[PDB]
Amino acid sequence: ARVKRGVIARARHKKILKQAKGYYGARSRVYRVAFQAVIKAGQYAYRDRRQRKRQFRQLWIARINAAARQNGISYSKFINGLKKASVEIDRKILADIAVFDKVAFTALVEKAKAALA
């Protein structure tokens, strides 16, 4: 029972090359380079599902720090204030209020300064 291996090899190669559309040059044409490109894209994608949590958090902290200094207190003192005021709003939402609702953020700063004093 000789098994020719054309049809299944074609299917594997094609699977990998479909996962590499949009890559520059051989990275999207040649199998032997698109295999490495697809794997290295896999490793980066893993690594960056962790980094997007780190990057979004540092973005939010920069926005709360900006808006809170606009209301006359730093980020450090603001988070200490709200923790002592026993407010448990996470900082995705504090960043989002700090962009969209300036008056609510002003009131949060008043709770923070009220408890912090």
Partner: protein
């Protein structure tokens, strides 16, 4: 939902005029770098130029502490081989003082296309007057 991103078509950005007489170079420079990034605005976004236009004036009257007036040396290399060219702080204030504030701020701003676009918003003058009366820069006391 998703975190808000500033859109560079719709970023409103203001004009500020800052008098640099007797300010410390690094401390002014760091405040300008913060305002030109847009770090002072709640709509800050790291890939969008959200900052303001700052008109620094009286750049020749900026101050430094210690012996940095004579010992702080600005090196650059010209590309030709033995092209290491130094100039102290007072030589730079005599020749072009705009280069003093602009070197400082430029080294505090992120390197890359965006931070070049951020530095295009800094306008420094060695004197007390500027051409930009049409843009109505309000006096940023810092």
């Amino acid at each position: 939902m998703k975190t808000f991103t500033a859109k560079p078509e719709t970023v409103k950005r203001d004009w500020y005029v800052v008098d640099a007489t007797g300010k410390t170079l690094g401390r002014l420079a760091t405040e300008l770098a913060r305002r030109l990034r847009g770090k002072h605005k709640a709509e800050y976004t790291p890939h969008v130029d959200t900052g303001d236009y700052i008109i620094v004036l009286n750049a020749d009257k900026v101050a430094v502490t210690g012996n940095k007036r004579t010992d702080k040396v600005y090196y650059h290399h010209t590309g030709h081989i033995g092209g290491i060219k130094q100039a102290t702080f007072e030589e730079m204030i005599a020749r072009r003082p705009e280069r003093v504030i602009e070197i400082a701020v430029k080294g505090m701003l992120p390197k890359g296309p965006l931070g070049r676009a951020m530095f295009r918003k800094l306008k420094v003058y060695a004197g007390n007057e500027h051409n930009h009366a049409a843009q109505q820069p309000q006096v940023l006391d810092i």
